[PDB]
Nucleic acid binder design. Sequence first.
RNA 1: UGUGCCUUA
Length: 400
Amino acid sequence: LPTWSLDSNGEMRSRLSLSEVLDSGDLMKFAVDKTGCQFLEKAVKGSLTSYQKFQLFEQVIGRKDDFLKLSTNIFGNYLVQSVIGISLATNDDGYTKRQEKLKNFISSQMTDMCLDKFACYVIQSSLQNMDLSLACKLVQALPRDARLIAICVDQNANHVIQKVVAVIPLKNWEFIVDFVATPEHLRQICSDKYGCRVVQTIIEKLTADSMNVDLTSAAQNLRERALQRLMTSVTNRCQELATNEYANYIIQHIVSNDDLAVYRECIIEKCLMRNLLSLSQEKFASHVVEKAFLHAPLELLAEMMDEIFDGYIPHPDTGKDALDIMMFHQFGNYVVQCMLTICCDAVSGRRQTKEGGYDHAISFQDWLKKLHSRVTKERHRLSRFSSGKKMIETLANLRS
RNA sequence: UGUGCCUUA
């Protein structure tokens, strides 16, 4: 920083004024220095005269190159956010031009800014704070090619997409839903640590839940169609997503959410039914199988239970059956525990048994009896394992 | 006995 601003011992003076810095032409040196930016930060939160604001608008958000240099700076991005806020709060004759200029600067450099570790915060704060009509234009500047995938899977940029979804009406980012829904895009994005969160956030925003009751019916129709288009793609690749280290969370979200009931049923039919024994032995998909048991409609739950109890031919030599395999499997054991807990909850009154115009308690009692009988017969082997002891305890607790 | 992400002075 400028020598004029330094004391005898090479430190920034203590009685420095904002106007001195603004007048000096040296703001850019202060803004990228920890101590200097800290000073500016505090100074700009105070009372500002019209000319101080004017200078800040010109020097921080007035020229594209300096704006980008501050926005992409570890310290400067904070000053940029503060000045954007002041600009938005200052309804003088220059307001429209300043905001249009900011929209132009960001739009022209959208991809580069989104992927930047610091400028992404400038984008996010602009999306939620700018006049909505102008914030929509930033969304319009998002890329539509391979760069959009890069944005969705980026440790920093994914949060820009999530902000868009949070604060911008759907019509503006509907293209992102369609982009993500393309088979190859869905595969790449869902199978990524950050991308899978982006997709879950999108699904959440497209869900007709209590948080969307403020939408017009026209907007609900728009949402409904977008949700349907995305769910079709997810359902078409259900098998692949359910077994994946990251996308299994998406499938679980859908299965677990009552507001996505129709899609829950599709998924269970399309990839889980007839595959329960195999999927229950998978590290990732076993969690999906658990969610399906916990949330399936009673008619489908009955089919799932029947598949475990009766769906598979026992080993030709040993007579070991699906329940035998699952009970002692490293992942399958948790699915059987889930089945048991569900039945104990039902017969204990902790879980509603009426559905479809009938009380299914008789079914849960039947399933419970089968599990109780197996656990009784195999108690010695089961007691060797934590999972076995837990099932024995679950049944014991039910009695009393 | 079994999985993730929520990122800046």
